């Protein structure tokens, strides 16, 4: 019984290992995506200020 | 010519924080500090500083004329500090109006160019491309045949 339980516990441990690795991958991908998002936001902000200036004039 | 030059020669830590932040943005170590004027303006707008493209384009037309794209630390720091508003509010409007009425002898509701030339030659400064007609080019906005105190401000407001 103990040896079978050991096999199953290692099974579960390895499954959680793999899932955590996949999650880290998705985390870094979303991280680079978020940086790109921030840059797009700043660009839009600058464009907005510019067009406001033009309209006032 | 010398004000920002003196400030850089006495490089302060408050400006140095942003300077070195943009430096690590630009220079990753053991570099010549190239930092092209186009890239310099890109980062200047990028890192949350003043997003004024006019100074950046002035640099681009002015800097990297060497053809190497590198920008020396002297002029890069000068344009960085002068991109920020470095002026003591240009004295007082009423005080400057009194200064100009001392300057303006005609008191004809304005001041003519020749009085400005007299005061300029009284100052005793060197002449360069921004002389002779640069004042004429800038001040001739509506071309009223004069350089009023208001027109003189329109030309070179914030006189310090």
Quick count: other Cβ atoms within 10 Å of Cβ B27? 14
- Token code pair at residue A31: 């991280």
User: In this structure, which long-range contacts are made by residues B62-65, counting pairs with CB atoms below 8 Å and at least 24 apart in sequence?
Assistant: B62/B37, B63/B37, B64/B36, B64/B37, B64/B38
Question: Which of B18, B8, B60, B55 lies closest to B39, judged by CA?
Answer: B60
CB B106 within 8 A of CB B112: yes
Cβ within 8 Å of residue B18, ≥6 positions away = B47, B49, B80
Conformation bin of residue A5: beta by default, left when phi > 0, alpha when psi is -120 to 50: alpha
Kindly list the residues from chain A whose CB atom is less than 8 angstroms away from the CB atom of residue B46: 39, 42
User: In this structure, which long-range contacts are made by residues B53-62, counting pairs with CB atoms below 8 Å and at least 24 apart in sequence?
Assistant: B55/B79, B55/B82, B55/B83, B62/B37
B46 touches chain A (CB under 8 A): yes
B51 touches chain A (CB under 8 A): yes
**DSSP single-letter state for residue B106:** S
B47 touches chain A (CB under 8 A): no
Kindly list the residues from chain A whose CB atom is less than 8 angstroms away from the CB atom of residue B51: 46, 49
Consult the annotation and say whether B143 binds a ligand.
no
Cβ within 8 Å of residue B43, ≥6 positions away = B22, B25, B26
Helix axes B73-83, B53-62, angle to 10 degrees: 160
Separation in Å, CA of A43 to nearest CA in chain B: 9
CB B51 within 8 A of CB B86: no
d(CA A44, CA A49): 9
Cβ within 8 Å of residue B5, ≥6 positions away = B74, B78
Kindly list the residues from chain B whose CB atom is less than 8 angstroms away from the CB atom of residue A35: none
Residue A23 sits at φ, ψ, to 5 deg, of: -65, -40
CB B116 within 8 A of CB B155: no
Quick count: other Cβ atoms within 10 Å of Cβ B115? 18
Quick count: other Cβ atoms within 10 Å of Cβ B136? 13
Element (H, E) at A21: helix A2-56
């Amino acid at each position: 019984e103990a040896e079978k339980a050991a096999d199953e516990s290692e099974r579960g441990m390895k499954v959680i290992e793999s899932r955590a690795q996949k999650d880290e991958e998705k985390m870094e991908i979303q991280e680079i995506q978020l940086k790109e998002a921030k840059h797009i936001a700043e660009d839009a902000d600058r464009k907005y200020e510019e067009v406001a200036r033009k309209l006032v004039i | 010519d010398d004000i920002y030059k003196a400030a850089v020669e006495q490089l302060t830590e408050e400006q140095k924080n942003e300077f070195k932040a943009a430096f690590d943005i630009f220079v990753l170590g053991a570099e010549d500090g190239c930092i092209s004027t186009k890239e310099l303006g890109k980062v200047m707008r990028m890192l949350g500083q003043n997003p004024t493209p006019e100074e950046l384009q002035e640099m681009i037309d002015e800097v990297d004329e060497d053809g190497s794209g590198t920008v020396d630390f002297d002029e890069f720091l000068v344009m960085m500090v002068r991109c920020m508003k470095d002026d003591s509010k240009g004295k007082s409007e009423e005080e400057l109006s009194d200064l100009f009425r001392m300057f303006d002898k005609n008191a004809d509701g304005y001041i003519d160019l020749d009085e400005l030339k007299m005061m300029l030659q009284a100052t005793g400064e060197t002449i360069t491309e921004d002389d002779i007609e640069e004042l004429m080019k800038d001040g001739d906005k509506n071309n009223d045949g004069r350089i009023d105190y208001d027109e003189f401000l329109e030309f070179m407001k914030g006189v310090e």
